Automatic annotation (TrEMBL):
InterPro entries attached to this UniProt entry: MBL_Glyoxalase_II, Metallo-B-lactamas, RibonucZ/Hydroxyglut_hydro
NCBIfam families in the record: bla_class_B_core, bla_subclass_B3, blaGOB
CDD domains (alphabetical): GOB1-like_MBL-B3
Any matching Pfam family: Lactamase_B
Alphabetical UniProt keywords: Hydrolase, Metal-binding, Signal, Zinc
Protein name: Class B carbapenemase GOB-18
Chain sites annotated for binding Zn(2+) 1: 82, 84, 159
Record-level Gene Ontology MF annotations: hydrolase activity; metal ion binding
CC cofactor: Zn(2+)
Top-rank taxon: Bacteria
Residues annotated as binding Zn(2+) 2: 86-87, 225
Domain (Metallo-beta-lactamase): residue spans on this chain: 35-225
Length: 270
């Protein structure tokens, strides 16, 4: 007896498509699929994994972790940028196989415990991912620590009630890098924000998100989807360690402003 999990029919090819893992900057590695970004932070006292792709991304991420010479059984903490099946699908698979602790934005708790049923938009699909129970809940500016690595949760709602970004420093032999793992504030609802009675604070949430995201200071930026930070335009698989590819700060602000431009254009319809 188990509530049936079913991902939407007709998912994009690039989501389950394999991508060769690489070193982003310092102790940050990309272990995701072609489009579904999954981040690995390697520490002295264990590993952190941010985002997991769909259900079928589980063997891929596990294989990518091994390819870089790391052990997925050493993942001590699991983190999320948004509570959608395309970033949560392998979360339960990881939690059971590794006995890692799962920390999430307080606002996304119900979506995770119900495997998508409570999502203001994704709920229409029922259970899109294996439900998971967080070991801890996080609020804006909360610190996650493992070894010398310290991550700060930045509450960036709208895309999901508890979508968030992470900001941390990492270092290589050369320098230190203030890394931002962004959850770009896009709009998934086709109807007026006033109609979205499931998410009462949707409009105000995005409005805050645009404000706070324009005032961030970082050296390197990446996002939930590869296409958002133009990964495949910047590099081809096999390309050597090059953090400067992800130092295109002006592109983060241009994409952010394009998202605010369409956000405001949506709200004028009232
Ligand atoms: Cl069922
Ligand atoms: Cl129910
Ligand atoms: Cl809609
Ligand atoms: Cl409302
Ligand atoms: Cl707020
Ligand atoms: Cl791209
Ligand atoms: Zn999403
Ligand atoms: Zn997504």
């Amino acid at each position: 007896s188990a509530q049936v999990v079913k991902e939407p029919e007709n998912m994009p090819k690039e989501w389950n498509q394999a991508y060769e893992p690489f070193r982003i900057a310092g102790n940050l590695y990309y272990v995701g699929t072609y489009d579904l970004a999954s981040y690995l932070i390697v520490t002295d006292k264990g590993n952190i994994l941010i985002n997991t792709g769909t259900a079928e991304s589980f063997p891929i991420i596990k294989a990518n972790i091994q390819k870089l010479g790391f052990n997925y059984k050493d993942i001590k903490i699991l983190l999320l940028t948004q509570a959608h099946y395309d970033h949560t699908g392998a979360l339960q698979d990881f939690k059971t196989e590794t006995a890692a602790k799962f920390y999430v934005d307080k606002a996304d708790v119900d979506v995770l415990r119900t495997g998508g049923k409570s999502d203001y938009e994704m709920g229409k699909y029922g259970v899109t991912f294996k439900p998971v129970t967080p070991d801890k809940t996080l609020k804006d500016q909360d610190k996650i620590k493992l070894g010398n690595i310290t991550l700060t949760l930045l509450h960036h709602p709208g895309h999901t009630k508890g979508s968030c970004s992470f900001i941390f420093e990492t270092k290589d032999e050369k320098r230190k890098y203030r890394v931002l793992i962004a959850n770009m504030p896009s709009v998934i609802v086709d109807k007026k924000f006033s109609e979205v009675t499931a998410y009462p604070n949707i409009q105000s949430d995005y409005a805050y998100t645009f404000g706070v995201m324009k005032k961030l200071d970082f050296d390197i930026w990446v996002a939930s989807h590869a296409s958002q930070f133009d990964l495949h335009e910047k590099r081809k698989e096999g390309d050597p360690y090059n953090p400067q590819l992800f130092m295109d700060k002006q592109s983060y602000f241009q994409n952010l402003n394009d998202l605010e431009k369409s956000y405001l254009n949506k709200i004028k319809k009232d």
